A paper describes a structure:
The large superfamily of labdane-related diterpenoids is defined by the cyclization of linear geranylgeranyl pyrophosphate (GGPP), catalyzed by copalyl diphosphate synthases (CPSs) to form the basic decalin core, the copalyl diphosphates (CPPs). Here, we used X-ray crystallography and cryo-EM methods to describe different oligomeric structures of a syn-copalyl diphosphate synthase from Oryza sativa (OsCyc1), and provided a cryo-EM structure of OsCyc1D367A mutant in complex with the substrate GGPP. The structure of monomer OsCyc1 consists of an αβγ domain and a catalytic center located between the β and γ domains. OsCyc1 catalyzes GGPP to form syn-CPP, in which new bonds form between C6 and C11, as well as between C10 and C15.
To elucidate the oligomer states and the interaction mode of OsCyc1, we determined the cryo-EM structure of OsCyc1 and finally solved three OsCyc1 structures in dimer, tetramer and hexamer forms, at a resolution of 7.9 Å, 3.5 Å and 3.7 Å, respectively. The six molecules in OsCyc1 hexamer structures were labeled as chains A, B, C, D, E and F, which can be divided into three dimers. Our analysis showed that the cryo-EM structure of hexamer is almost identical to the structure observed in the asymmetric unit of the X-ray crystal structure of OsCyc1. The catalytic centers are located at the outside edge of the dimer, tetramer and hexamer cryo-EM structures. The interactions between chain B and chain E occur on α11 and the loop between α2 and α3, including key residues D298 and K302.
Author numbering:
A (entry chain C), B (entry chain A): 80 to 767
C (entry chain B): 621 to 767
Write the structure that this text describes.
């Protein structure tokens, strides 16, 4: 009920470190260690106290909600070569490798998509030491003549100079590389002690170089997890970004105003002009973390340098990694195109050069299956992308996709791959949906009785008579854009009062052209403003805006520009009376930048409505994308005042300036068919 | 009864466009119309199937519970000149033509004006198509040239030329009008195309001009309405406008408040300034259907206007018809007496000009037996209007109007007038009488058990130490005035609060009628009220109204005003706190609705008691008329505030102000010998 | 403010054809107006207090009309018997009005109750002060300076 929001709070009140599934391939690699005394033997025999309980009837390991033997082989032969060194509990290995003989012909049958890290590289390092004990296993195999022969055709191409002088990503999987040096390569480590944040790449060196200061990397893991080891630790800032990236896309984050910035507190201290990574103590950066942080650092309003992308592109090619090539997966280029829209005109042109890459990169790849990822599997990854390419940030309502994000999100039925596949429950649950399919569902419930209540007032106050062809389609259109922006149950008085004066100014806009302007109108028009009920805290200064609005028609008598943008000054000034909020009076730049914001908001809709008249004449395109090349810069200049804290006017009045003008950008970018779908999706058809 | 209480709901929510009987004369006019697709027989064979198989073996056609051959010859002679003409089952032609020629002698001695509309002009239209078949038709009858003389006087009462400049109501029976210009007719039809919305016009249309649009109308009401033609379709603004007039007059409408709101809006969706017809799209409109729905909509807080009644004032006259001055029935003028009872002083005086007409129109024809009802046969014409005219709206109680209403309605016991004696089955069903009279029957036990329940309270509380004149008449009349305004069973509790605390104020009146007041009585009477059924939910609430009332007995002592101007505010102050509903703080007009209301009722009953202190004193009627014309004007504004839709004050808190002065306005206009004739009816002489 | 103007304007059409004057609600136009310019909101969250603010307008409005036919007969004196009798009906309606404003066992604030006293005292004094005297009061209080 309400405690589901409490449970995520207590799952966020205690953020120490990551929630990752405990792995088994490196559990054999840590359990294969002699004691420093040597009498105790294995160092942490809790690993044996974990394996003989975490097991299924075929003796197998891992993907207990799936089936993939290509990783499961790497935990079924590793667990038995750890079971014959100390040579305890020989009861289920002889059946646990006998099942592999049943499926030693099921090896080469998985697709090109699932090729794990260390596959042709780190797996033959298991096999030649498996036969060090010479257990009953088919060594040669005609299916294995790919990982055998093209072992070298993966590794002999990289030079031994660049791996003995320069730090690159090959320090994670290092068992496949042999005859290396330890004394000259020990100054190119990670910061906490690891070799690229993987304990196997410590344990491959702890056997030759017993670095006691690196023993405390593993000893700290078996103390914190109380036995057992996962494949990657730590994941502190990988945890933080994927927490909040789900939260604002799901739409439950607005209860957590204390907590949401607290993650952003840890990022702004560790932000650098070079980049950031999965953990903080890793040198080799990438593209994902620099990009997706910037879309979340800038959004809540922290000034963040937009020049970090200059490292991660070269020669007109935006690479996924520093110093190493990539067959470009979608999971960089999705969120790289997402942060390619929050731009300011004062920024560097590298942000311009990114979106001219990804749109050329993602438009063509929609037909064939090149949009798949080699590192994930989930319910709908590409379905989000086709929405993001055609619905930009400038015209998206903040409610339409929040309904659609439910229809694309699997939850904890989605698995990440690595060396060993795993899940993340501080990140994905079946509970974030339970919070979302509770509060959004009753919001969908509690708002459709409001339009039921908003119906009859329109049909009783004598105003429905004239205007359009039918009242009902204008009634549901005017409440959609007036409630998709403000969606919480405490500001309904602003919400419904918006939608009323929305329907007031347009049926009288219809009435003036039907008589030909205000030259031959005789009925008094300042008395229609009283059909809104009298309240004391609101309706005093409300009527002052309608009076000053009336003379814009006498101003636009015999002058042939459109009259849409000045009607936005109705909405942007009436609504704040329903919030009872002045500007802060005594501060003159507060007086200034409100007026500076009022001008540009009135200036978008002159450009937009003239475009709609220019396009519906069937005129050519080389002028109507010029209007798109004219309002692309008056949209981003609107953002710099909103996002950056340009003066001390409180944020509450600043969302609404953007909340009105995005709605007018939405009407002029959706055909009259496709909004009638979105009305039918988010309002009526209930979730569960 | 849940079969019947929901049974009205399930029947009155399946409202199509009415349910009326199949005609026997218009169905004859469409049966002779053949196919047009190169066929052999009729276009509509299932209408002649309804002709063949419905018939009652007495020989005639028409209605079942009436024998007026003024209807039957239109139902026989037109019907038998069709199926013989198509030569389809002429076996039953002699079956019908046998009994006519020896029973058509009764046509000579008929009644003057129980004749069908357009009977005297459509029967000579049958003669040229009867001698087309030339059966043994005895034309020798004095009802033949005497209507020929009326026919050529109807070729002298209708004009040819000026008729095309404006439509008139004779387009419902236009078979007596032939050989005219038809492209001048084409711009004189409604959007159904059928002239005066009647199917008989289109039979003449397919002799000249094969328009598709006058065909699909007739084809849809046979092929989708399952054979046979009605007399006028549709009937949507007659079946909704009268069923709300009938069901609310029963008084059992309280269980249907979800439903009466909707059909009233379809009245308002069809609201026009030039009136409301018997159908939705008629190009001609009446006054009686106009000035009835006007009255009902004002009685439910809607926004109406009586400025639309300058369109039937015939220079100080009124008529049912728009252009002609024919002698009408009483029910146009009966309805305009109902609507001119209540008004607001911001209007035209046309309702004054009509009420001085509608009294003086009905004043003489009450005194004689001139109760001619030309368009409706019903049970009790003069006795109902004798209740309506000889009892005013200011003293019209909601229960001495429903107890009398179980006397005049029959349900199936009516028959309606059109071109065919037809019937309705929706609002002319007596199935409600198995419910509503049983609702009064369980109402009668719902008031009987508290007759004795307030007898024993008068003894056990012992108020007879200063009781007064006569208990059993005055305990009853206090409960007559308390049960004649609140009778819903969920609110049966606070009704007993009314009749109880009223007599307490009558008791201390009989204490202070002769002992002066506070200057001779040291009696406290503070906690002496608390012999009432008393809760802590009335923790102080009765005491502050009490001592303020005794302060009026203190202050107005040795004055000469009425000491019932304080009792009137006291009762509703007592009634509401028994019912337990509070006002909000709200805006300033909300108490301004309150504080202007309580001045009006404190002025009227103080004014009203002057007349009771004048009639028995026997003074001049100039003072009587100058105490009546003043007390009517205080009423005429007062009724607006209790009957608006714009009231911020709560709904049921409003009409309680109306109810208590209604009892004050009643008993000043009645005698004790007319009052027992109401007491023995609504309490003692039960139904059934 | 302007609804009380609208409530005063609709009360014109109440006595549009009647024989009364507009004085019995001109004060209600003014006793409401001091609460506006001043923001003095009433607390009707309790039932007996709203029963008193309604009752406070009961006393004033009858006085204003009983003074109205007083002064229009005062210029005439067509019934000199009732001239010394209308005002002996008036005073014992003032006698109860000046009770409830002066007393304190109510729940209304102190400063807003004498506003009821302030309107009728401005109203009653000009009914008893001749036009020869109302000017002779003004000059020697507000124009002819002290010290």
């Amino acid at each position: 009920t309400t405690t589901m929001i409490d449970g995520i709070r207590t799952a966020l009140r205690s953020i120490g470190e990551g929630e990752i599934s405990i792995s088994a391939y490196d559990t054999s690699l840590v359990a294969l260690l002699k004691r420093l005394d040597g009498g105790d033997g294995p160092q942490f025999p809790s690993t044996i106290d974990w394996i003989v309980q975490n097991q299924l009837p075929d003796g197998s390991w891992g993907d207990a909600s799936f089936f993939m033997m290509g990783d499961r082989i790497m935990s079924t032969l590793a667990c038995v070569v750890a079971l014959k060194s100390w040579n305890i509990h020989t009861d289920k290995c002889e059946r646990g490798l006998l099942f592999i003989q049943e499926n030693m012909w099921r090896l080469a049958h998985e697709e090109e998509d699932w090729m794990l890290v260390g596959f042709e590289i780190a797996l033959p390092s298991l096999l030649d030491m498996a036969k060090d004990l010479d257990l009953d296993i088919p060594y040669d195999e005609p299916a294995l003549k790919a990982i055998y022969a093209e072992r070298e055709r993966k590794l002999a191409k990289i030079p031994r100079d660049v791996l003995h002088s320069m730090p690159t990503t090959l320090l994670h999987s290092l068992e496949g590389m042999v005859d290396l040096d330890w004394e000259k390569l020990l100054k190119l480590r990670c910061l906490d002690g690891s070799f690229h944040c993987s304990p196997a790449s410590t344990a491959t060196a702890f056997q030759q170089t017993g670095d006691q200061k690196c023993f405390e990397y593993l000893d700290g893991i078996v103390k914190k997890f109380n036995g057992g080891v996962p494949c990657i630790y730590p994941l502190d800032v990988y945890e933080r970004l994927w927490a909040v990236d789900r939260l604002t896309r799901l739409g439950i984050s607005r209860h957590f105003t204390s907590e949401i910035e607290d993650c952003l507190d840890y990022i702004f201290r560790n932000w650098t002009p070079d980049g950031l990574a999965h953990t903080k103590n890793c040198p080799v950066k990438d593209i994902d973390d620099t990009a997706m942080g910037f879309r979340l650092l800038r959004l809540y309003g922290y000034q963040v340098d937009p020049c970090v992308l200059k490292k991660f592109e070269k020669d007109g090619k935006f690479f996924c990694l520093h110093g190493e090539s990539n067959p470009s997966s979608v999971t960089p280029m999705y969120n790289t195109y997402r942060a390619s829209q929050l731009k300011f005109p004062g920024d560097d042109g590298v942000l311009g050069r990114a979106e001219v890459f990804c749109r050329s990169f993602l438009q063509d790849r929609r037909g064939s299956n090149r949009m798949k990822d080699k590192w994930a599997i989930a319910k709908d990854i590409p379905g989000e992308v086709e929405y993001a390419m055609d619905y930009p940030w400038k015209a998206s309502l903040p409610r339409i996709e929040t309904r659609l994000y439910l229809d694309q999100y699997g939850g904890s039925g989605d698995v990440w791959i690595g060396k060993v596949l795993h899940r993340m429950t501080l990140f994905c649950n079946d509970l974030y949906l339970k919070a979302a399919k509770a509060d959004f569902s009753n919001f969908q419930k509690e708002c459709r009785v409001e339009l039921n209540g908003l119906r009859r007032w329109y049909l009783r106050s004598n105003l429905e008579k004239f205007g359009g062809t039918d009242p009902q389609t204008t009634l549901m259109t005017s409440y959609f854009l007036a409630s998709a922006n403000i969606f919480e149950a405490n500001r309904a008085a602003e919400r419904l009062g918006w939608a009323r004066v929305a329907l007031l100014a347009d049926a009288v806009s219809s009435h003036f052209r039907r008589i030909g302007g205000p030259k031959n109108s005789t009925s008094n028009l300042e008395e229609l403003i009283s059909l809104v009920p009298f309240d004391d805290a609101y309706s005093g200064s409300l009527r002052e805006a309608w009076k000053q609005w009336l003379m814009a028609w006498t101003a636009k008598e015999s002058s042939q520009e459109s009259i849409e943008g000045d009607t936005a000054i109705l909405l942007v000034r009436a609504i704040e009376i329903f919030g009872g909020r002045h500007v802060l009076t005594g501060q003159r730049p507060d007086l200034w930048e409100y007026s500076q914001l009022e001008q540009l908001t009135s200036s978008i809709c002159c450009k937009l409505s003239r475009r709609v008249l220019a396009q519906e004449n069937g005129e050519s395109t080389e002028k109507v994308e010029e209007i798109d090349q004219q309002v692309d810069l008056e949209m981003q200049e609107l953002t710099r005042r909103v996002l950056q804290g340009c003066s001390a006017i409180n944020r509450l009045t600043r969302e609404t300036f953007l909340h009105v003008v995005k709605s007018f950008c939405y009407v002029a970018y959706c055909s009259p068919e496709t909004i009638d779908s979105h009305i039918d999706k988010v309002i009526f058809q209930d979730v569960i």
